[PDB]
Structures are given as C-alpha cells and as structure tokens.
C-alpha cells in the first residue's frame with residue numbers, strides 16, 4: 001500500500017498540511033510523534049494566533065487542529081519516524097519495526113529551542129520561563145527579567161523586551177559575543193539592559209512562577225542568586241533535520257532548503273514546512289501558513305505524476 | 306503626528322499584521338476600507354482555517370480577528386486609502402480629505418477575484434457560486450457544476466473538482482485557451498469534464514441556491530439553459546496594487562514583488578503581505594502567516610532606524 005502523502009510532524013505546519021491534504025481527498029498518513037502537538041503543546045496562553053479575540057491555550061489550539069484534521073479523514077499516528085528513504089518515486093518511513101510508503105512526503109518536524117538543561121527550567125515553562133519574547137514578552141510588564149545567550153537572538157530578545165520589562169539582565173557564559181556588532185551595540189546603548197558575562201544559570205527558582213535564578217561565574221565558580229520573575233532563553237534553535245541529512249539539501253545551520261517562495265526541497269516529491277525551514281519568523285501562524293502551502297505544492301506535484 | 310506603522314487592508318494579512326504590531330506596542334493605524342474584513346467576509350463556511358474543528362463562518366472568523374487587533378490597541382478605521390506617498394522616511398496616506406503619516410507602511414490590500422458581472426452571481430456567492438475549488442469544492446459531491454475560464458486556474462479548478470463532482474462543464478468564451486498545453490491536455494483527458502467553447506454565462510439562476518445557468522454562444526448568439534448546482538468562476542485575479550503602481554515594483558501581472566522569502570518591497574520601509582503578493586496559494590491561513598511576517602519585518606526594520 002503506497003499512500004499519496006505522508007506528513008512527518010504534528011505542530012501547526014503538519015496539522016495544517018494534514019487538514020488541506022485530507023480535505024483534498026489524499027488520505028494523508030501523519031506521524032505525530034510521541035511528543036505530539038508541536039511547541040505550543042508546551043506553552044500556556046497563545047494570544048497572537050489570529051482568530052481568538054480572547055486567546056486560547058496552546059494545548060486547546062493544537063487539539064482543535066488535530067480534531068480538524070481527523071474530521072476530514074487524516075490518519076493520525078502518535079508515533080515517531082525513526083528513519084526515512086526519500087529518494088525515488090516511492091518513499092519509505094520506518095517507525096520502530098513498521099514501514100510505511102508514499103508518493104509524496106511533507107517534512108514538518110519543526111525546530112527545537114535549545115534548553116539550558118537546569119532544574120526548574122522545564123517546570124516553569126509558561127510560568128515565567130519563556131523561549132520567545134514575541135510570544136510572551138507582553139506578560140512581563142514592569143518586571144525584572146533575564147535573557148540568556150550571546151547571539152543576535154539574545155540581543156534582539158533583550159532589546160525588544162525593554163518596552164515591557166522594568167529591567168533586563170542579559171546573561172552570557174563568556175565575555176565575547178556571537179552577536180553582530182550592530183546588535184551588540186544596540187543592547188549596550190539600551191539603558192534598561194545590564195550585562196553579566198562569564199555567567200551561567202544553574203537553577204531557576206519558582207513558587208509556582210519564576211522568583212529568581214541561581215548564577216555561577218564560569219571562570220571563578222563564584223555563585224549568587226538574582227531575584228527575577230522571568231527568564232527568556234535565547235541560546236539558539238536546532239532544526240529537526242536529522243532524519244533527512246544526506247538526502248535533502250540543508251543550509252549550514254541544518255535548516256531544510258526550499259525552492260524560491262515554495263515548499264519544494266532538493267528532492268522530487270519532498271516538501272518542507274514550518275520551523276524546519278523558517279529560521280526568521282518562527283510563529284505558529286507562519287508555520288500553519290507554510291503547512292498549507294506544502295499541501296498545495298504536494299497536491300499539484302502529485303497531479304503532475 | 307507620525308505613526309510607527311500604517312497598515313492598508315483588513316483581510317487576514319492586515320489584521321494579523323495589526324495584532325502583531327499592536328502587541329509589539331507599535332500602535333498600528335489600520336485603514337480597513339469600507340468593504341472591510343477581506344474576502345472571507347463574503348463567503349459562508351470556512352473549514353480549512355486551522356484551529357476550528359467544526360469550522361466557522363467567514364464573518365465570524367474575521368470579527369474574531371478584528372476584535373483581537375482591537376484588544377491589543379490597534380487603531381482601526383473603516384475608511385479607504387485613496388492615495389499614498391511611500392518614498393522617504395515619512396510616508397503619507399490620503400483618506401478622502403484627511404492625511405495620515407507613518408515611518409513604515411504594510412500593504413495588505415489583497416487581490417480581487419474577477420467577476421462575471423451577471424445577475425445572480427453576487428446573490429448566490431456562498432450559495433453555489435464559488436471562486437475557489439480548494440475552499441468550497443468539498444461541498445459539491447456528486448453534483449453537476451460548471452467552471453468558467455480558459456486559463457490554468459480554470460483547468461486546475463475543473464480537474465481538481467472532478468474528485469467531488471458528478472460532472473464538470475468547463476465554459477470558455479472563445480475556442481482558444483490561455484492555459485498551458487499540459488493543463489489543457491489534463492482537462493481534455495479527464496472523463497468527467499465537458500467543454501463548452503464560444504460560450505458565456507449570462508445569468509445564474511437559484512431558488513436560494515444555484516439551480517442553473519443561462520448560456521449564450523459568443524459567435525451565433527444562440528442561448529440555452531444548463532441545469533447545474535454549482536458555478537466556479539476561474540477567470541483570474543486582479544491584485545489591488547493600483548495605489549502603489551509607480552512607487553513599488555510590481556510584476557507583469559501587478560503583484561507586489563518582495564525580496565526573497567521576506568515581505569520587504571522595493572521601497573525602504575514598505576512591506577507587503579497576503580494576496581497582493583502571493584499569486585500561488587491564496588488562502589486565508591497563508592495570508593495570515595504573511596501578515597505576521599510583515600509585522601515582524603516592519604518591527605525589525607523600525608528598530609534599525
């Protein structure tokens with residue numbers, strides 16, 4: 001049995017691709033992962049996804065998406081794809097000891113936000129720990145917060161956040177920055193930003209919400225505690241392109257490359273959407289838009305066969 | 306008073322730009338038009354916009370969008386922009402006899418689907434007359450329908466629709482087609498498609514929903530009536546770029562050109578989103594995604610000033 005299309009991933013890109021493909025009668029087979037529902041499944045309030053005047057929680061929105069895909073006939077499997085063979089007229093995915101095949105594959109595996117890996121970080125996500133100033137910065141008006149990282153994201157997140165926060169402490173594990181000179185100098189000029197270089201977070205403290213961070217000097221080992229009510233982690237993203245490395249062309253940071261303003265990858269019959277591709281906007285609504293585009297691309301390509 | 310950003314248009318692109326810009330504290334000034342709310346304000350059920358497992362009407366979705374923009378502080382004006390001056394550090398829009406200025410402008414004026422201009426067409430939109438097989442084709446399962454046009458859209462719409470319809474009659478006002486040979490030959494090979502060349506629709510009949518079309522031979526003037534329950538108009542789209550012609554670079558069909566996979570136009574400080582730009586996908590979710598992108602582009606550009 002060779003399916004018309006297999007979708008790998010269950011964030012906004014994968015579910016929007018599934019909705020369009022199912023409504024187009026392609027009977028999409030979707031591998032959601034065991035950690036299904038994408039990045040919003042791990043946040044609380046989502047307020048910038050257009051269509052909800054009062055907002056909606058991340059899990060509520062993703063369940064709507066999932067049930068919508070189901071309603072039109074998508075075959076959803078809460079299983080991880082462990083390996084793929086994407087070259088040729090029949091593509092194969094391997095799920096544990098099971099194999100599935102399709103004429104077209106839509107890659108929607110997303111990108112992981114890099115984690116500090118310290119106690120308190122996961123428990124307090126959506127409770128004062130955030131990965132996205134555009135998403136949650138609104139909620140820290142007149143508060144003292146930290147931003148972690150030494151690249152352009154950290155500089156952009158920190159400077160953006162000062163329109164809300166009382167103060168921003170930018171914490172970086174060395175005394176040299178990966179950020180561009182422009183971004184670094186913008187943060188230095190900002191009166192609400194204080195730098196702590198050669199500093200790492202070892203623990204995030206929080207009653208039910210963030211109350212402070214434990215700090216450590218990366219040179220001397222000196223430790224101390226900082227009272228803050230928000231922590232923005234901006235230490236980069238890792239596109240989940242491991243499955244397709246060596247098959248689909250990637251950029252130097254591992255994002256899947258696509259042709260022009262389409263979702264076509266370097267491989268015939270293989271399309272890519274969402275934060276697996278986009279390292280610029282990284283929002284639910286942009287990922288959803290690209291998932292729709294991938295399914296329209298796939299349907300048109302399938303019609304050409 | 307010079308605003309940070311003015312948004313022109315109130316479809317999914319303009320309202321999503323407004324939500325992001327307002328939540329970013331840019332106090333966006335949005336000119337919605339007197340025919341506000343974009344193309345969905347004129348349809349009935351919207352089922353492929355991700356986030357609504359049971360669907361939502363077009364006006365319901367657009368009102369959510371509008372109230373969402375309002376909630377975060379967008380200044381919405383139900384007025385048409387009649388002229389713009391987009392070059393330079395301060396851009397001006399003229400609304401009747403009033404002028405408004407901004408450092409950045411987001412163009413979200415959309416594209417108009419071309420109309421037949423015949424009695425019954427407007428009254429029966431959402432009631433059997435459609436402009437979008439991807440959107441509404443689902444609803445005509447086992448019905449006899451028509452598609453109007455002689456280009457690639459008409460050929461694509463007609464061939465796509467045969468997975469639902471009992472039959473598709475493709476009506477074209479001449480005996481020569483603008484469609485590519487591939488698209489024309491795909492439609493000719495399709496057993497469910499019948500062509501009527503040198504034929505135009507003069508009236509769409511419909512009790513509350515489409516019941517038939519009145520036809521006229523464009524050579525002989527012979528008229529007759531065809532019993533059908535759906536009419537898909539696929540005679541092209543006109544991007545609403547008239548305001549900006551001669552200021553922003555356009556392609557040969559009048560769509561606003563943008564740089565790479567961004568929303569930057571040829572003019573500094575001017576960004577463009579939605580179906581004003583995209584002549585490929587033309588969905589609410591893709592327009593919303595690009596409106597978000599335009600506001601992130603604009604915010605980053607403004608920060609650089």
Ligand SMILES: Cc1cc2nc3c(=O)[nH]c(=O)nc-3n(C[C@H](O)[C@H](O)[C@H](O)COP(=O)(O)OP(=O)(O)OC[C@H]3O[C@@H](n4cnc5c(N)ncnc54)[C@H](O)[C@@H]3O)c2cc1C
Pocket residue numbers: 008009010011012013014031032033034035036037038039040042043045046047048049079080081082108109110111112113125126130131132135136240243273274275276282283284285287
């Ligand atoms: C804490 C947090 C809060 C956020 N808040 C907002 C917000 O408020 N508004 C907004 O617009 N954006 C927000 N975002 C960003 C938004 O969630 C992402 O940009 C969006 O989800 C990207 O969607 P995507 O489909 O490309 O990838 P993802 O959301 O990453 O989804 C990918 C899914 O596919 C699964 N998958 C990956 N590989 C496989 C595989 N081999 N096999 C099977 N399944 C696989 C993954 O486990 C995951 O579930 C937030 C992100 C985070 C981390």
Ligand SMILES: Cc1cc2nc3c(=O)[nH]c(=O)nc-3n(C[C@H](O)[C@H](O)[C@H](O)COP(=O)(O)OP(=O)(O)OC[C@H]3O[C@@H](n4cnc5c(N)ncnc54)[C@H](O)[C@@H]3O)c2cc1C
Pocket residue numbers: 313314315316317318319336337338339340341342343344345347348350351352353354384385386387413414415416417418430431435436437440441545548578579580581587588589590592
């Ligand atoms: C009948 C119909 C049914 C559809 N059904 C679906 C569906 O079910 N699912 C889906 O995904 N897509 C659907 N679509 C397509 C979808 O609606 C469009 O792709 C989407 O709305 C494009 O949004 P946009 O913001 O770029 O432009 P538009 O929707 O065209 O919005 C532009 C708005 O800006 C206003 N405007 C324009 N110029 C000015 C000006 N100078 N000054 C002030 N205001 C101005 C316009 O009047 C308009 O209100 C449908 C379209 C139609 C016509």
Ligand SMILES: NC(=O)c1ccc[n+]([C@@H]2O[C@H](COP(=O)([O-])OP(=O)(O)OC[C@H]3O[C@@H](n4cnc5c(N)ncnc54)[C@H](OP(=O)(O)O)[C@@H]3O)[C@@H](O)[C@H]2O)c1
Pocket residue numbers: 114115116148149150151152153154156173174176177178200234235236237605
């Ligand atoms: N110009 C813009 O508008 C803009 C905005 C955002 C991103 N970008 C671009 O996107 C790309 C990636 O940018 P990025 O900032 O997200 O990632 P990045 O350039 O790779 O920098 C990541 C930062 O996080 C630090 N880091 C990584 N893991 C850490 C850990 N466990 N603990 C503490 N610190 C850690 C790194 O420190 P080390 O230096 O020690 O490794 C580094 O400073 C860049 O090319 C950037 O220019 C541009």
Ligand SMILES: NC(=O)c1ccc[n+]([C@@H]2O[C@H](COP(=O)([O-])OP(=O)(O)OC[C@H]3O[C@@H](n4cnc5c(N)ncnc54)[C@H](OP(=O)(O)O)[C@@H]3O)[C@@H](O)[C@H]2O)c1
Pocket residue numbers: 300419420421453454455456457458459461478479481482483505539540541542
């Ligand atoms: N390959 C694809 O997947 C695909 C899909 C869609 C679109 N496209 C491309 O998009 C571009 C536009 O395509 P399009 O088909 O939307 O528009 P188009 O190429 O301009 O063709 C429009 C058709 O509608 C007819 N028409 C216009 N007004 C009419 C009226 N009032 N009454 C009756 N007929 C009318 C025209 O007839 P006349 O010939 O007499 O003018 C013409 O045949 C093209 O470049 C196309 O290749 C490609």
Ligand SMILES: [Mg+2]
Pocket residue numbers: 035036037038039040041042
């Ligand atoms: Mg996840």
Ligand SMILES: [Mg+2]
Pocket residue numbers: 340341342343344345346347
């Ligand atoms: Mg309209």
